Design a protein around this ligand. Structure first.
Ligand code: GDP
Ligand code: GDP
Ligand code: CL
Lengths: 178, 181
């Protein structure tokens, strides 16, 4: 079985890609390739390279977001459990400024979503627990919280469909409400 | 909290490295960094790049191994549940040929292991379900099952301590037991 990906651009947000890998499934479970340079590196222009791998473990009803920065490309998926992955267009000069797109991602719907820079990244844990896998492509230093922007999960201009009005939020994401 | 890695060489097998990251924990759960080029690309020789990420989801009592090949560096961990990760030295001309080391890896013990080429890679699932993550660094094309070597999980020369005598096995890993039958 050769390593494969189905690759398509979003019909809703320009620059967002939906990447679906094949899987070898047997009685032991499943094997799959999330990324290779040769297959996926050509999706990111101007010399910017994936150089950073992160994992985020979270409980049911947790919502992290909406976070973004001016330079980082992100490739995101859920490798255990299930998340409501929401991409928001945070490019003020974009015609789809504050439009959004939801992908319900799990091992049964194993999409990886590519976000260009200046986009809003968020996810809501709809399983008892979830593992979010997160590859970052950027020049220079990692932009931690102080060098990221934040939109409120419940911003009335974006009007995202979320399965709750009382998510488990961090101080940063609560303070974005006011 | 800045991203941190602790790197130390195995006390048992030359060239095997044990990587330990920090984690930010709070009411939502845990954030951590498995890899950055800046901190971990030196693990592997210059000219050779981590260019390939794989996930392997397995059920309790599955054992995959013992597998390796002539060119592939592997960085391995378990990002959900728990595995008995066992590195075997399969370098014929090494003073530790067919010695082994076990790492019980889980989110509670978040260790990543660097295997150089010509080592046996193996893991046993001790959790209900596990997710195994590994990065591959190699030149040229991926060596699939037909261009790899296999030692039996229960090879009497290696004599690994496993929690089972009857694991769930692939065709490949059963046939490796039958070589001198
Ligand atoms: N689609 C897909 N198939 C793969 C991948 N890796 C391995 N395979 C196939 O999965 C099968 C089992 O491979 P093997 O290396 O023996 O797996 P292991 O026993 O878990 O280490 C083989 O038929 C491979 O060609 C992958 O990343 N994606
Ligand atoms: N050790 C470690 N801490 C991190 C990492 N990423 C973020 N943090 C810290 O975790 C906290 C939350 O950061 P934030 O980006 O707001 O997380 P989010 O709310 O999950 O999107 C901050 O203290 C960061 O400094 C990491 O990869 N490793
Ligand atoms: Cl909803």
């Amino acid at each position: 079985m050769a390593i494969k990906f189905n690759i398509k651009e979003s019909k809703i947000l320009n620059g967002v890609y939906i990447i679906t890998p094949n899987k070898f499934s047997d009685l032991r479970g499943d094997i799959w390739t999330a990324f290779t340079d040769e297959y996926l590196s050509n999706l990111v222009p101007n010399g910017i390279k994936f150089k950073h791998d992160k994992f985020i473990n979270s409980h049911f009803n947790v919502l992290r977001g909406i976070h973004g920065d001016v330079k980082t490309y992100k490739l995101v998926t859920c490798v255990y459990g299930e998340v409501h992955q929401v991409v928001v267009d945070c490019r003020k000069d974009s015609p789809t400024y504050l439009k959004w797109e939801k992908f319900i991602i799990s091992p049964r719907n194993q999409q990886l979503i590519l976000l260009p820079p200046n986009m809003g990244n968020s996810h809501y844990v709809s399983s008892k627990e979830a593992v979010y896998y997160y590859k970052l492509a950027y020049k220079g230093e990692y932009l931690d919280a102080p060098d990221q922007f934040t939109y409120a999960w419940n911003d009335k201009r974006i009007a995202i469909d979320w399965p709750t009005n009382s998510p488990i939020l961090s101080e940063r994401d609560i303070l974005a409400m006011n």
